[PDB]
Motif scaffolding. Structure first.
Motif, short mmCIF file in Angstrom:
data_model
loop_
_atom_site.label_atom_id
_atom_site.label_comp_id
_atom_site.label_asym_id
_atom_site.label_seq_id
_atom_site.Cartn_x
_atom_site.Cartn_y
_atom_site.Cartn_z
N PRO A 133 0.81 14.02 53.71
CA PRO A 133 -0.39 14.42 52.94
C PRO A 133 -0.25 14.21 51.42
N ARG A 134 0.81 13.56 51.04
CA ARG A 134 1.03 13.17 49.67
C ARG A 134 0.54 11.72 49.43
N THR A 135 0.61 10.88 50.47
CA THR A 135 0.19 9.48 50.35
C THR A 135 -1.27 9.33 50.72
N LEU A 136 -1.77 10.25 51.48
CA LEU A 136 -3.17 10.31 51.76
C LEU A 136 -3.60 11.70 51.41
N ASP A 137 -4.80 11.87 50.96
CA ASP A 137 -5.19 13.14 50.39
C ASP A 137 -5.99 13.90 51.40
N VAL A 138 -5.74 15.17 51.51
CA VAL A 138 -6.54 15.95 52.39
C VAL A 138 -7.44 16.85 51.58
N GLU A 139 -8.72 16.65 51.71
CA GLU A 139 -9.64 17.46 51.04
C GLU A 139 -9.96 18.57 51.96
N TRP A 140 -9.54 19.71 51.59
CA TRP A 140 -9.74 20.83 52.40
C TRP A 140 -11.05 21.43 52.06
N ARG A 141 -11.85 21.60 53.04
CA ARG A 141 -13.11 22.15 52.85
C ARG A 141 -13.10 23.52 53.51
N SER A 142 -12.70 24.50 52.73
CA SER A 142 -12.59 25.87 53.18
C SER A 142 -13.96 26.46 53.39
N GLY A 143 -14.90 25.92 52.66
CA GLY A 143 -16.25 26.39 52.69
C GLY A 143 -16.44 27.55 51.75
N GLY B 159 -11.99 28.21 61.32
CA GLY B 159 -13.12 27.34 61.45
C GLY B 159 -13.36 26.57 60.17
N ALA B 160 -12.30 26.45 59.36
CA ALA B 160 -12.37 25.69 58.13
C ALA B 160 -12.36 24.20 58.45
N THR B 161 -12.76 23.41 57.51
CA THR B 161 -12.89 22.00 57.74
C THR B 161 -11.90 21.23 56.90
N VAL B 162 -11.22 20.31 57.49
CA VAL B 162 -10.32 19.48 56.74
C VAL B 162 -10.79 18.08 56.78
N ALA B 163 -10.76 17.44 55.68
CA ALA B 163 -11.15 16.07 55.61
C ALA B 163 -10.05 15.29 54.97
N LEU B 164 -9.85 14.10 55.39
CA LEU B 164 -8.81 13.30 54.83
C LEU B 164 -9.33 12.01 54.29
N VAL B 165 -8.69 11.55 53.25
CA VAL B 165 -9.00 10.29 52.62
C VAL B 165 -7.70 9.51 52.40
N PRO B 166 -7.70 8.21 52.69
CA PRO B 166 -6.53 7.37 52.50
C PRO B 166 -6.27 7.08 51.01
N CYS B 167 -5.61 8.04 50.33
CA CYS B 167 -5.26 7.98 48.91
C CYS B 167 -6.42 7.51 48.07
N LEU B 168 -7.41 8.32 48.03
CA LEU B 168 -8.61 7.95 47.40
C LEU B 168 -8.85 8.79 46.18
N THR B 169 -8.76 10.08 46.34
CA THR B 169 -9.15 10.94 45.29
C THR B 169 -8.29 12.21 45.20
N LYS B 170 -7.07 12.06 44.77
CA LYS B 170 -6.27 13.23 44.51
C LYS B 170 -6.66 13.83 43.15
N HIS B 171 -7.89 14.32 43.08
CA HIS B 171 -8.39 14.95 41.90
C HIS B 171 -7.86 16.36 41.86
N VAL B 172 -6.88 16.54 41.05
CA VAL B 172 -6.15 17.77 40.95
C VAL B 172 -6.26 18.29 39.55
N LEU B 173 -5.49 19.31 39.24
CA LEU B 173 -5.48 19.85 37.90
C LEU B 173 -5.05 18.77 36.92
N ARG B 174 -5.73 18.71 35.82
CA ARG B 174 -5.51 17.67 34.87
C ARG B 174 -5.07 18.26 33.56
N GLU B 175 -4.50 17.45 32.73
CA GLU B 175 -4.11 17.89 31.45
C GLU B 175 -5.30 17.85 30.50
N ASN B 176 -5.69 18.99 30.08
CA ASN B 176 -6.85 19.16 29.23
C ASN B 176 -6.78 20.51 28.61
N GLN B 177 -6.88 20.58 27.31
CA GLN B 177 -6.87 21.84 26.66
C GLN B 177 -8.27 22.42 26.64
#
Length: 122
Positions: free
Chosen positions: A60-70, A104-122
């Protein structure tokens, strides 16, 4: 080792690849509260990827799992995301319990598409 403080959970197998990025199938697969993103990945895939050896199962590091907890919306999860920091105690596999997902949460996966995570921004 008495480890029963985990929850056999129901997770909805979905993928956010594109044509069915939320409207594909949705298969109820079971996991544990004390799973790991990698392990959950295995269980969720195991239903479709039945027979697939360990080396072929994507981490799950090479492909991203977008967890949709709802409840919390959707978060990009990884075996090591926020815990990918190697400076001290941070190196740790993520559980669904970290995200505190409901049954009953939903998991979605993407083949290394959008690991939009915490970013560096003040």
């Amino acid at each position: 080792k008495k480890d029963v403080e985990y929850r056999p959970l129901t997770l909805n197998a979905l993928l956010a690849v594109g044509p069915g990025a939320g409207e594909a199938q949705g298969v109820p697969v079971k996991v544990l509260d004390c799973d790991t993103i990698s392990q959950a990945k295995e269980k969720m895939l195991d239903q479709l990827y039945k027979g697939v050896p360990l080396t072929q199962r994507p981490d799950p590091r090479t492909l991203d799992v977008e967890w949709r907890s709802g409840v919390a919306g959707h978060l990009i999860l990884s075996d090591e995301d926020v815990t990918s920091e190697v400076q001290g105690l941070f190196r740790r596999l993520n559980t669904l319990q970290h995200y505190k997902v409901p049954d009953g949460a939903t998991v979605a996966l993407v083949p290394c598409l959008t690991k939009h995570v915490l970013r560096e921004n003040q």
